[PDB]
Every structure is written in C-alpha cells, then in structure tokens.
C-alpha cells in the first residue's frame, strides 16, 4: 500500500512553477500512476513532461495540483491507476485518493455520511433564535 | 485600482514575488512570519471605498477653503 | 508544382433562410432565447469562427470572405471621403489660397439651430472644419479639381462593389480548400513582391509622371486651372523636359545603369520644401522606387514550385543554441495551423507600425501644407497613437486565445514556448520589479518636485535651474543627426528632420518645423513613458503566460480564455482569466497613450508651433512654459489642462459648440462607465427581481426573462464606456483647442 | 417577396431601427415646418 | 475550514462529486431518493471553497451548500 | 550542450540551474560573501556586512541632503547615516525577537543568539564604516567633490 | 578569462556542465577580425582620412592628452567609440558562437 | 551625386563576369535542382542570371562610384 519512494519520475526539464520552502517544512503531495506508453503530458505547474512506460511518481505542493493532473490523465490517456498521497516532513505518508479503493462518485459500503442535514435548506433556523446560544442553525 | 481590478490577478502577482524572494540570495535569509496574500474581495471593496471617499473629502475641502479665501466673496 | 489552386465549387447555398434564424451558427444559441443573456450571447461570439466549427478549412473560408467584406467597407468609406471633397467642400478655394482657407468637407442641415456649426472656414464657404488631412493628400496627388475627385469617388464605389462580390463568390461559389491557405511561402512571395513592390512601383510612376509636374507648377505659383491635365505630361515629353530636363533622355539611362542622369527628379535632398513646408516629392519618388526594388527582391526569397528558395521551416529549425533547447522547432506548424497566433503577431506589428507612422509624420511632414495645418498634425498623431495602442493590446488578446485553445504541449516539447512557460515566474518577477523601480524613479521625481515647489524650496527640485537630469544620450543622438549631412550621409544635402537641429522652417508665417530641444522635463516624461509601457506589458504578458494554469488555479485552460472567476475560494479568484488581463491592460494602454498625446500636445504648442516675426524670433502658442512647468503635477494640471480647456468651455454659441457639447457628453459617458465597473451583478439581478414583480402585477412580464448582464459583460460594458468617454473628452479638448489657436 | 427575407425584416434590431428612424424622421419634419414650439400655443 | 452541508433534497446525480477539484465529496447509500444514494462531505479540511459543487447541483435550491469559514493553508490554495 | 538543467538534480523543485544561478563564478562569489563564508562567527559576519554598508551610506546623504550646500554637509550626512543605522538596528532586533525561538545554538545566523550576535556586529561595523567614510571625506578634497577638484 | 581554451580549469557554465569559454582565442580573433577590416580609410569628417579603428585610436590619444577633461558632446570620440564597440561586441558574439559551437 | 557612366564594353564586362560568377556559384550553393550538364534547367538559369544582374548592377554602380568604372 505504502508509497514506494524509489519509483522513477516522469522526465522533466524543470521549471519555476514547482514547490517551494513550505513543501519541505509543512507538507508535500505525491501522485503515482501506471502508463502503457512513454508519452507527453502537461504538468499542472508549468510546461510539458514525458511520462515513462510503467510506473510514474510526482511531487506537488497542493492536493488540487495532484487531482488536476489525475483528471487530465484519465480523460487524455484513459489512466485511472492513480494514487494520491500526503507526505509530512516527519516522513509519515498519508494515503489520500481514492480514499477507500473506490472513487468518490461510485458508492461503497462502509461509507458513513458526513454533513447530511435532515431537512431542506429553507428549514434552517433564523440567526436571532440562535444568538448568544451555541445551538447550530441547521435545525 | 481597488474597485476596478479584482483579487485573482493580484494573487498571481504575489505568487511570483514569493518565488522571487525565496530564490534571491542574501534576501532569502529574511523570512515572513505571515504568508503574503492578496487582499480579500470585501476588504478590497472597503479599501477602495476608503480611498475614494478620502480623495473626495480632501479635494473638496481644499477647493471650498482656498477658493473662498483667495476670492474673499 | 505542390503550390496549386484548389477550390470547392458551390459550397454554401445563397439563401435567406438562415438570416431568419438568429443564432444558427452555434448549437447553444440556435434553440432560441429563454433569458435576455441569449441576446448578448448572440452578438459576443458571432465572429468567433473557431468556437462554432471544428474544421480549419471552413474557418479559413469564413475569414477570407470576411476580409473581402471589410475591404468593401473601407472602399465605400474612401469613396465617401472623395465624394464629400468633390461635392461639399472648399477644396478649389484651398488650392488657390492654402495658408488662409481652412479645409471643410462637411456641411450640416438646418434643423434645430444646428446650422451654427457651419462656421466661416474661408473661401466663400460654410461648413465643419475637417482635420483628416485629405486636402493635402489630394494636392500631393495632383488632383487640382473637383471633377477628378468625382472620378476617384466612382473608382472607390466600383472597388467596393467588386470586393463585396468577391467575398460572396469566394464563400458561396468558389471556396478554396485548406491546402490553398496553408501556403505561407507563396503568400509571402506575392505579398512582398506583388502587393508591396508593385504597389510602391506603380505609386512611384504616378509621382514621377503626375505628382511631380503638377506640384512643381503649383509651387512655382501657377493657378490650378492653368495647370495642364495629367495625361499631357504623359504624352508630350517636351513639356516634361522643360520642367525636369533629364526626361529628354528617356529610359536609356535606366537600362544602361547610368542612373545619375535621373538626379533631377530622383533626389536625396532631405529637409523640407521651403514653399510648402513638406517633404520634397522628388525624395518621396526616389524613396518609393528604392522600396519597390527591395520589396520585389525580398519576394524571391521563399521556395514555391521551382527548387530555388528557402524553406521557412528549415530556417526556423536551424536556429537553436545551447541556452534554448530545441529552438524555433514547431513554430512553423503553429503559424500555419493557428489563425489566432498569426493575428497576435500581425496585430502587434500593425500597432507598432501605426505608432511609428505617428512619430515619423509630424517630424518629417510629408504632404504640402500639412505642417502648418496644426489641427491636422495634432489629429493624425493622436489618431494613429490610439490605433497603435488598441492593436497592440489585441495582439496580447489573441496570444492569450492561442495559448488557451490552439496550444498543444505534445508538439511543443522543449522548444521556445515550452521554455518561456517554464520560467514565467522569473520573467514576471523581474518585470514586476522593473515596473516598481521605474514608477518610483519616474513619478516620484514629480512628487518630489510638487513637494519642494510647495515648500518654497525651488533649489531642491529636479529642474534645469536646480538639480539637473539631463537627457545626454538623446541630446548626443540629436547632435549626430545634425552633423550627418555631408559627413555620415555625404550625398545628403539637409537633415532627415529639423527636429534634430538646424533651421526654422516657416510657411505662411507659421513654423513648419524647428529643433525640439530636450531638457529635464523631457527626461522625466520619457521615463514616464517607459514606465507606462513596461507595466502594460506586465499585465498583458502575465495574462498570456498564466492563461493555461497558475499556482492559484491549476486547470485554468479547462475554464477557457474568458471566464469570470473560479469562485470565492482560495481567498477569491475574481478576474483570473487571460481575458481579464486584456481588460486590465486596456486601461493601462489608455493611461500610456493619454500621457503620450498630452506630452506631444504641450511640447509642440510650447516649443515648436507658433508664428515667426520680425528679427526671425518665433512666438510659440503657449510661450515656452513646458520647460519650467512640466516638472510638477500642478504644472500639468494648471498650465496644460486648465489653461487649454478655455477654448472648449467657452465654445458655446460658436461653430465649435459641437466640441463643447461632446466634451460634456464624453465626461458623462466616462462617469456612467464607473457604474458598471464598481458594481457587481448580484445587486442588479436582485433589483431586476422587484421590477419583474411590478411587471408581474400588471400581467406584462416578458417571455424573454430579464437578466442582469454577465460578470464578463459587465466588465466589458464598463471598459467600453470608459474608453469612449476618456478618449472622447480628449478628442473634443484637443480639437477645439487647436482649431481656435492653430 | 420571399417569406424568409420578410421574416428577417421582422427581427427585433431591424424593426427597432426602422421604427425609431421613422419616429426620429417625423420629429425632425415637425420641427422643420413648426420650429421652436416651447409651449402648446393657446 | 469551510463547512459543507448536504440537504435531503439531493437526488443522487453525483454531479457535485465529479465537479469537486479537491475530493471533498463522495457518495453514500440512502433510501430517501430514487437514485438510492446521497452526497456526503467527509473531507472538508481539504475544501478550498471554489463552490463548483454548488454550480453542478440541479435541485432548485442547492442540496449542497458551502459555507465559507476559517481560512487555512489548504483552504487558501497556497503552494507556498 | 545545454546550460539549463534541473536545480540540484530535482526536476520538480521551483528553481532552475542557469548560468547566473549556478555557474562557478556565481558560486565563488556567493560562497565567499560574509553571509555565506565558512569559518566565520555570526558577529564577524555582522562586522564585515556592517563596515561595507555603513561606509557607502554616508555618501548619498552628504551629497544630496538638505544641508548639502552648507559647510555642515558632511556632519549632517554622517548624522543622517547614523539615524538610518539606528532605525535599521531596531528593525534587525525586532526581527530577531519575533522570528527565532531561544536555543543554545549560536554559530548559525538563523538562531536567536546567532541573530543577536549578527545585530551587535552589524551596528558596530556600520557606525565604524560611516565614521571611516567621514574621516576620508573630511580630509581628502577629491572625495568632497566628485573628482571635480582636478578640473 | 574565467576559462581558457585548454582543458585546465573546472569552470562550469552552469551547475554540472563544464564548458570551455575560449576567452583568449575568441577575444584575440574577434579583435583582429574586427580591427583589420576597420582599417579601411574614408575621407569623411568623422574619420578624417583614417579607418574607424585608427580614427578611434587617435581620438583615444587626443582625449587622453587632456586627461581630466571628458570629450564633449560634439566630439567624434563618442560616435567612434559606439560604432567600434558595437561591431566589436557583434564580432565577439559571432566568434564565440562559431568557435564554441562549430569547433572547426 | 555619385558619378555613373554611359554604357561601354567595360560595363558589359562587369555584367558578363557577375552573370557567369552567379551561374557557377549558384550551381553549387542551390540545394534543390558534367559540372553544369547535370540537372541544370531554366529556373536555375533564370535565378542565377537574376542574381547576376543584381550583383552586376551593384558592382557597376560601386565601381563607378569609386572611380574604377
Ligand atoms: C461611408 C461613409 C460616409 C459617411 C459617414 C457619410 C456621412 C454623411 N453624408 Mg455622405 N456619401 C457617402 C458616404 C458617406 N457619407 C457616399 C459613398 C456617397 C455617394 C453615394 C455619399 C453621398 C452623399 C450625399 C449626396 C449627401 C451625403 C450626406 C451626408 C451626411 C448626412 C447623411 C444623412 O443623414 O442621410 C440620411 C439619409 C437617409 C436616407 C437616412 C437613412 C437611415 C437608415 C434608416 C439607416 C439604416 C441602415 C440599415 C437599417 C442597415 C441594415 C440594412 C437592412 C436590410 C436591415 C453625413 C455627414 C448629405 C450631405 O452632406 O448634406 C450636406 C448629402 O446630401 N452623402
Ligand atoms: C500579386 C498577388 C497578390 C496580391 C496583390 C494580393 C493582395 C492581397 N491579398 Mg493575397 N494572396 C495571393 C496573392 C496576392 N494577394 C496568393 C497567391 C495567395 C495564396 C497563397 C493569397 C492569399 C491571401 C489570403 C488568404 C488573404 C489575402 C489577402 C490580401 C489582401 C490584403 C489586405 C490588403 O492590404 O488589401 C488592401 C490593399 C489593396 C491594394 C486592395 C487591392 C485589391 C486588389 C485585389 C489588388 C490587386 C488588383 C490587380 C492585381 C491590380 C491591377 C492593376 C492595373 C490597374 C494595372 C490584398 C488585396 C487577405 C484579404 O483581405 O483577402 C481579401 C487574406 O485574407 N491573400
Ligand atoms: C509602374 C510604374 C510606371 C509606369 C506605368 C510608367 C509608364 C511610363 N513611363 Mg515611367 N518611370 C517609372 C515607372 C513607371 N513608368 C519609374 C519608377 C521611373 C524612374 C526610373 C520612370 C521614369 C521614366 C522616364 C525617365 C520616362 C518614363 C516614360 C514612361 C512611358 C514609357 C514610354 C517609353 O517606353 O518610352 C521611353 C523612352 C525611350 C527613349 C525608350 C510610360 C507612360 C517615358 C516617357 O514617355 O515620359 C513621359 C520617359 O521618358 N518613365
Ligand atoms: C484585425 C483585428 C481583429 C480581429 C479580426 C479580431 C477578431 C476577433 N477577436 Mg479580437 N481584438 C482586436 C482586434 C481584432 N479582433 C483588438 C484591436 C482588440 C483590443 C481591444 C481585441 C481584443 C479581443 C478580446 C479581448 C476578445 C477578442 C475576440 C475576438 C473574436 C470574436 C469577435 C466577435 O464576435 O466580436 C463581436 C463584435 C462586437 C460585439 C462589437 C462590439 C465591440 C465594441 C463595443 C463596439 C465598437 C464601438 C464603436 C467603434 C464606437 C461607437 C461610437 C459611439 C460614440 C456610439 C474574433 C476572433 C474575443 C474572443 O473571445 O475570441 C475568441 C475576445 O474576448 N478580441
Ligand atoms: C492614481 C492611481 C493609481 C496608482 C498610484 C496606482 C499605483 C500602482 N499600480 Mg494601479 N491601477 C489604477 C490606478 C493606480 N495605480 C487603476 C485605476 C487601475 C484599474 C485598471 C489599476 C490597475 C493596476 C494593475 C492591473 C497593475 C497596477 C500596478 C500598479 C503599480 C505600478 C508600480 C509602481 O509604479 O510602483 C511605484 C508606486 C507608485 C508610483 C505609487 C505612488 C508612490 C509615490 C512614489 C509616492 C510614495 C510615497 C511614500 C510611499 C510615502 C511613505 C510614507 C507614508 C507611508 C507615510 C502601483 C502600485 C501594477 C503592479 O502592481 O505592477 C508592479 C499592475 O500590474 N495597477
Ligand atoms: C425630457 C426632457 C425634454 C423635454 C421635455 C424637451 C422638450 C422640448 N424640446 Mg428639448 N431636448 C432634450 C430633452 C427634452 N426636450 C434632449 C435630451 C435634447 C438633446 C438631444 C434636446 C434637444 C432639443 C433641441 C435642440 C430642441 C428641443 C426642442 C424641444 C421642444 C420640441 C417641441 C416639439 O416637438 O414641437 C414640434 C412640433 C409639433 C407640432 C409637435 C420641447 C419644448 C426644440 C424646441 O422647440 O425648443 C424650444 C429644439 O430646437 N430640444
Ligand atoms: C562579424 C564577423 C563574423 C561573421 C559575419 C561570421 C559569420 C559566420 N561564421 Mg564566423 N567567426 C568569426 C566572425 C564572424 N563569423 C570570428 C571572429 C571567429 C573566430 C573566433 C569565427 C569562427 C567561425 C567558425 C569556426 C565557424 C564560423 C562559421 C560562420 C557561419 C555560420 C555560423 C555563424 O556564426 O552564424 C552567423 C550567421 C550569419 C552571419 C548569417 C545570418 C545573417 C544575419 C543577418 C546575421 C547578422 C549578424 C550581425 C548583424 C552581422 C554583423 C557584421 C558586422 C557588422 C560585425 C557564418 C558565415 C561556421 C561556418 O559556417 O563555417 C564557415 C564555422 O564553422 N565562424
Ligand atoms: C565590388 C563592387 C562594389 C563596390 C565598390 C561597392 C561600393 C559601394 N556600394 Mg555597393 N553593392 C555591391 C558591390 C559594390 N559596392 C553589390 C554586389 C551589391 C549587392 C546588390 C551592392 C549593394 C549596394 C547598396 C544597396 C548600396 C551600395 C552602396 C555602396 C557605397 C556606400 C557604402 C557605404 O559607405 O555606406 C556606409 C553605410 C553604412 C550604414 C556604414 C555603417 C559604396 C561605394 C550604397 C550607396 O550609397 O550607393 C550610392 C547603397 O545604397 N551598394
Ligand atoms: C567596481 C565594479 C566594477 C564592475 C561591476 C561591479 C562589480 C558591479 C562594480 C562594483 C561596484 C560596487 C558595489 C562596489 C562597492 C564597493 C564598496 C561598497 C566598498 C566598501 C568599502 C568599505 C570600507 C572601505 C570600510 C572601511 C571601514 C574601516 C576601514 C573601519 C574603520 C574604523 C574602525 C571600525 C576601527 C577604528 C577606526 C574606524 C575609522 C572607526
Ligand atoms: C493593489 C491591489 C492588491 C494588492 C495590495 C496589497 C497587497 C496591499 C499591500 C500594501 C502594503 C503591503 C501595506 C499597505 C500600507 C498602507 C499604507 C496602510 C498600512 C496600514 C495602516 C492602516 C496603518 C490586492 O490584493 C487586491 C485584491 C482584490 C482587489 C483589488 C486589489 C488591488 O487593487
Ligand atoms: C446597470 C448595471 C446592470 C444592469 C444593466 C442592464 C440590465 C442593461 C439593460 C439596458 C437596456 C435593457 C439596453 C441598453 C440599450 C441602451 C439604449 C444603449 C444600447 C447600446 C447598444 C448595446 C445598443 C448589470 O447587469 C451589471 C452587471 C455587472 C456589473 C455592473 C452592472 C451594472 O452596472
Ligand atoms: S465576486 Fe463575482 S467574480 Fe469574484 S468570485 Fe464571487 S463571483 Fe466570481
């Protein structure tokens, strides 16, 4: 499951759009995927890179940069074998996406609903009733 | 400037300046405690309104006092 | 023979059916309106051909026929300028007395008291004074009568009909295939050799056989109706020899290479004609002939159908060094498959050429009696500076559309585009620093001077009297150009322009041209120019370079060229598109060109234009106040805007009352624009809800549901009315001022 | 006359331009024959 | 962080989940609607506040509602 | 041959290895500057940086200040340099107070004690360099003009 | 002279790429290849009967005689200096391109 | 004004020389087409003679300028 750090990266000539000091002191994100070919893609941070046949690995500063590349590869090259990780400066690696092996738009058992409100949006509480009270406006 | 130009432009400028500070020798020894960001949407509306209003007041005050003093009538 | 003509016959049927179906060209709009946004969406995207069609062939066909339609409009416009000169003008009176009669080719009808605009322009005529310089063009052409202006108007009408026919024919009857349009070598060969070279050559023939004899007779003092008709110069060589004796030898000196025989009419005089204050037409004839040879030679460079010539792709692919990766590889494919990339280049070039035209025409006045018609000189400078600034911003607009749409990284691996995008942070950070440094050290000098002058410390100012900022490099270049005749241009007789130094040229007791000296004020306003040009480049370059993705929005290319925002998140991403940098950069273009035309207007009135008097001294229009008053902002406010707005604001009840009204009308429109620029759509949609309620109450609600304009359209309406009001106010101020005093 | 060309002349911008040009034209004609009507003459 | 709510008017069209650029939303099982599924927001610490989910939603007033709240490095979209 | 490569072998860091950034000449200059030179205590780094900055600060104040045409121009220029020095030392001290946690390490610039040492050295060297510039300009008529004494 | 033609120094044009700047050969060859054609005389008031290199060198000596005083705005020194160094830099650029790149 | 000369056999000489020069030199340099009897056709002849009248006209005018004639 865990990120094999030794995976070769896509060939790239470098750019100024990559990650900065906050990546090595706050968090960095990684994306891995399998390619059937040695083909050109566009980096979220800049110009063009070439993905190597087999397994690829990138490091990006934002999670959204990892997911923007993931949508681009899925539509352009029909690759869905992408895994997104969060990596902390302690060395600890956090698997992120897809979170339980199944993509979020496909249903899965054992997913518990978070954020679900039992009434429609117009049935919320007016601000005055919950003033100087800790009670939430969602009913 | 605060009322016509909006946030997305300025945030992309500030990101090029953050890069330049981090890459410039003898200057990257000095670090911000707070990450430089563009002003918020509401804050920029307020900053432009304050500048507009202050310019309105100062211009008219100079005219109404100086024209009356200079003319005396 | 791979360069060949290939045509589809009868592609599109000439039918009125799609005229009756507005929105037929796109799948979204063709199903009809449901909200008022559809109406705006109909006009906004209509000439965006590559958003309706996928195929490059149909796009190319639509563009070719739309270019014929534009040519038809230009020919009709030219025909109307010639017809109004023939029928409603005092051109004949102007030819007899140029330095007294004021050109006028527009007469108003008497309806609501508006016939006050038919002022006394002179020559027994009443009309609106015109400042386009057509009279001087016609006199340089050798027109000399209204009848020939009627024939020119008819020639324009015939050409206009031929262009609108050709656009119809080449879209509906005979439309070329894509492989015809993708012939860049053939097109360049014909447009350099054929369009430019033959055009220059044919004009040189007209100047030698028609313009030069008629204008020599006019400047000798012969009356216009006493001058022989232009074809008697063509047939009787004896009269042409009497004017210029080299014509006695004919074309034998041309073919035997004994070209110094033709020095009567092919000169290199330089300077100005003393009689008219214009360029020597013998110089312009030699100039056009020299250009024609160079353009025709240039036209033989590229390879078309016989093995001689260059491959443009090979030239581009060979230029690559150690800093730049694969080099210019892949640029040929871009520039023959993307119309937007070509329009980006050609708009930047057309705008640059229009700014060069603006500079070169006041400094080396080409037409007879145009240098002392000061309303025309101010008008044609201001007009070509505005056309230049607009076209330059459209080059960055279509560079952004190229990057968002036509750019594909697979064909652009490690070439020059890929490398620019991969160090765009270094480019924009260094440009940003230059714009900050140059705003501090240009405009802060003005703020320093306002503060010192206000404090009573005139010795602490940046001025000629006090601390001096001297434009030593420009003064030195002026020295070189004044020393050039007989030295580094040995066969020149005079300087290229008297602006660099030399004599005062006076025509009709008015200065044509005289040296434009540079001091501390000139140093300061030139660095103001460098600052405003730099930041305008930064806004447009930042828009083109970050059009596809940023650190802010990693997938900006999927949203397109023109989107309003990507939501209030990430702190707020309002105005993040490439379109919004064109939107913001047209304001800075407006700022730049406004200071350029103000600098020109004040400097020419203060130090160049005026009346020569006894003892050879010259009294200028504003009496040389530029040097000591263009160094503070208060000087520009008082001695330029306030002092020279006297003529526009006192114009009521005269023939210039139209400028007085347009001054106020444009002040109004400008202010009205800030309603659209400072406001947001959500307020106006909620206000429209209550107005819709009042219509619902009376059962008169429309079936096309009213909407507030989109976020992008709100920005576009604000920018359009801002540009109209600001430029219109300057137009009214400039024209009333210079018609009254110049 | 062709019904599709008449349907084009029935489109909103054409009718708007024709109707207000006609409107403008009879205001212009009324102020030509009867100018400076500051008041209803009575 | 931003607070994202899903109200029971959700028809289970999955459009918000496909539109979300930061993987905040996912589909869970629910018998309330015909589609048998409702959106859920388990990962709101990653919400940047783009409101692309709200744009995608087809119910009359949005079943998904984003309430912009406290800002973080994640919700500011800062790569520095 | 290519002169632009990924920074420190890493293609995904936000920098490039360009001749200005990483040539031998650049690395020699950067490695030998007092901020980065090896074997220097932070106080000595402060002294060398201060001597340099204090020395050039005197000149613009003296030549272009309000009292430049007076005979107290050099006095006013030195004292103006001193005022700027005191304000900048206040800026350095407050940066140190808010940017570094208190730890025993004192031989690096980016530590609390190392920053306090650098600030101490920078103030001493800066006043020293300004004083040296004052002495040189006071005594040598070439420096009082722009070299204009020779003409 | 940050690196000569011989493989002696370790000067790397960038992080990891060693590149021999041929500062002696390029400077010498570009100087001679620019100065020798420029010896062509011309009876123009700027040149005064000399070539551009020789009139330039003459104007260096003339202004060095009046050592503290700078040459004036109308003095031929500035125009000679500009054109000379313009063509010299162009010939160094083209020479460095030709020698480093084509290597023969 | 630079001094040009009426046509003489020396002018003819310069024209002929430049013309032959451009034939031979063009024959080698041209990249798309028995030293002159392989692949020599009318467009190559017409191009080399067009460059011949260009080089020849420049040579005639320059040699007339300097006094060589
Ligand atoms: C192309 C540029 C151009 C411009 C800007 C002008 C401008 C002018 N001309 Mg000139 N003119 C031109 C070309 C031009 N002309 C040409 C090419 C000719 C030669 C044929 C003339 C011949 C000419 C004459 C003979 C006269 C003018 C006059 C005038 C003035 C008043 C025109 C007017 O109010 O009539 C308005 C006339 C109307 C019939 C009103 C028509 C309004 C309609 C409704 C416009 C609608 C367009 C339509 C809806 C488009 C869509 C088509 C449809 C199928 C939907 C005005 C200054 C007059 C003048 O100077 O008097 C002193 C005058 O008498 N012009
Ligand atoms: C000698 C050949 C020749 C000439 C003169 C032109 C001229 C022109 N082309 Mg080009 N073109 C050529 C060959 C030529 N083309 C070839 C071979 C191709 C195929 C590769 C193209 C493909 C091409 C495209 C795809 C487009 C053009 C366009 C244009 C117009 C540019 C806009 C402009 O400045 O017009 C204004 C200037 C003028 C001088 C107007 C002149 C109008 C006529 C047509 C000029 C020639 C008349 C005739 C030869 C003169 C007879 C003289 C006689 C009285 C003695 C201009 C008319 C553009 C355009 O606007 O299309 C309409 C455009 O989009 N051309
Ligand atoms: C496209 C441009 C153009 C056109 C249509 C013409 C057309 C003409 N020129 Mg002009 N001409 C032009 C460009 C042009 N020229 C240029 C660029 C130059 C400068 C080199 C001249 C210089 C020139 C001279 C010096 C003469 C003509 C003459 C003529 C006429 C030719 C008569 C002839 O063969 O006997 C020519 C005479 C021989 C002895 C042979 C004819 C009207 C001749 C003429 O009739 O004068 C009115 C004449 O003498 N032309
Ligand atoms: C040769 C010139 C040229 C050409 C062919 C094009 C062509 C195009 N441009 Mg480009 N552009 C140009 C110049 C040009 N532009 C210049 C000079 C600028 C700088 C301002 C731009 C800025 C620009 C932007 C920012 C955009 C385009 C877009 C487009 C496309 C859509 C056009 C459309 O449907 O508009 C329809 C036309 C209109 C709606 C006309 C209304 C425009 C103004 C408000 C009316 C004019 C006012 C009038 C002159 C004065 C009124 C008088 C007053 C007193 C009453 C098309 C590919 C758009 C696009 O998305 O393409 C992909 C787009 O967003 N262009
Ligand atoms: C008078 C109005 C005004 C002013 C001063 C500015 C100022 C600026 N704009 Mg803005 N702008 C304006 C109107 C204005 N804009 C409008 C109306 C728009 C609408 C479209 C924009 C849109 C816009 C964009 C899109 C861009 C700018 C940019 C810039 C900067 C240019 C760089 C520069 O000159 O730095 C130097 C600063 C100045 C010249 C400001 C005046 C400072 C003087 C010297 C006095 C300083 C006093 C001093 C600090 C006092 C200290 C003590 C005090 C604190 C007590 C600068 C911050 C660009 C930018 O940021 O790039 C760098 C940029 O991209 N502006
Ligand atoms: C809502 C404001 C308003 C009002 C009430 C009027 C009312 C009037 N105007 Mg004024 N006007 C207005 C706006 C207004 N105008 C605007 C915005 C403009 C600028 C375009 C003008 C420009 C204008 C002019 C230039 C003239 C008028 C004239 C007139 C009169 C025309 C009577 C008529 O048609 O008889 C016509 C005859 C009939 C039988 C009907 C009337 C008193 C005219 C007048 O008579 O002045 C006294 C006149 O010459 N107006
Ligand atoms: C100004 C002097 C000059 C010029 C014009 C050239 C030109 C050329 N050299 Mg040479 N070279 C020079 C100085 C110069 N070199 C010196 C000083 C050295 C020694 C250090 C060399 C050593 C050298 C070698 C070892 C080789 C060349 C080669 C070449 C050719 C192609 C490669 C190149 O440099 O592209 C330059 C490309 C062009 C000049 C043509 C492009 C046309 C544009 C308009 C360029 C103009 C640039 C500039 C404005 C011209 C300035 C001229 C003058 C006023 C200074 C080209 C003919 C190579 C070759 O092909 O072998 C023969 C090769 O192997 N050169
Ligand atoms: C070997 C024969 C020969 C000779 C002696 C000359 C000599 C000359 N030519 Mg010619 N030339 C020649 C061949 C020759 N050229 C060829 C083969 C061509 C190609 C077609 C040219 C094309 C050419 C052009 C296009 C021009 C000259 C010019 C000149 C003269 C001025 C150069 C100068 O100092 O400007 C110095 C200018 C600078 C900018 C230097 C810095 C000079 C006397 C020019 C001139 O003034 O002619 C009267 C001119 O316009 N020549
Ligand atoms: C030239 C050049 C050419 C090529 C390009 C280039 C590199 C950009 C450019 C360089 C330009 C630049 C940037 C040149 C920069 C040059 C600079 C800034 C030189 C600074 C010198 C400082 C001195 C001499 C301080 C001396 C202090 C002393 C002796 C101490 C005295 C005191 C102490 C404490 C001890 C007690 C007594 C007192 C008197 C109190
Ligand atoms: C210029 C500009 C910026 C950039 C402006 C910034 C980053 C402000 C930075 C100014 C300096 C750093 C501090 C300002 C200091 C003031 C003189 C006042 C200081 C505080 C006093 C009240 C005490 C935006 O971020 C922005 C965002 C949204 C819409 C429009 C705009 C906009 O127009
Ligand atoms: C007034 C205003 C509106 C409302 C404006 C509307 C609904 C325009 C409707 C005006 C009428 C319906 C048409 C205007 C016609 C005029 C007579 C001029 C026509 C000009 C050409 C288009 C014909 C917005 O929608 C808006 C949106 C975003 C920022 C600012 C604003 C804003 O300021
Ligand atoms: S304000 Fe208007 S533009 Fe800025 S984000 Fe909210 S919606 Fe998009």
Residue numbers in the entry:
A (entry chain D): 3 to 141
B (entry chain B): 661 to 733
C (entry chain A): 11 to 189, 192 to 754
D (entry chain J): 1 to 42
E (entry chain C): 2 to 81
F (entry chain L): 2 to 152
G (entry chain O): 22 to 125
H (entry chain K): 10 to 42, 51 to 86
Q: Please, what does the article write about this entry?
A:
Photosynthetic cryptophytes are eukaryotic algae that utilize membrane-embedded chlorophyll a/c binding proteins (CACs) and lumen-localized phycobiliproteins (PBPs) as their light-harvesting antennae. The R. salina cells grown for six and 12 days (corresponding to L-phase and S-phase) were harvested, and utilized to isolate PSI-CAC complexes. Comparison of the four structures reveals how cryptophytes adjust their PSI antennae in response to the different growth state.
The 14 CACs were named CAC-a to CAC-n in a clockwise direction when looked at the lumenal side. One subunit (termed chain-s) contains one transmembrane helix and binds three Chl a, two Chl c2 and three α-carotene molecules. Chain-s is sandwiched by the inner CAC-a/b/c and the outer CAC-l/m/n, and forms multiple hydrogen bond interactions with CAC-a/b/l/m and PsaF. While the two L-phase structures contain PsaQ, we did not observe the density corresponding to PsaQ in our two S-phase structures. Moreover, the two CpPSI-ACPI complexes purified from L-phase cells exhibited structures almost identical to our two L-phase PSI-CAC structures, and appeared to contain the lumen-localized PsaQ (Unk1 in CpPSI-ACPI)12. Together, these results suggested that PsaQ is strongly associated with the PSI-CAC complex in L-phase cells, but does not or only loosely bind to the PSI-CAC in S-phase cells. The final overall resolutions of maps of R. salina PSI-14CACL-phase, PSI-11CACL-phase, PSI-14CACS-phase, PSI-11CACS-phase are 2.7 Å, 3.0 Å, 2.9 Å and 3.3 Å, respectively.
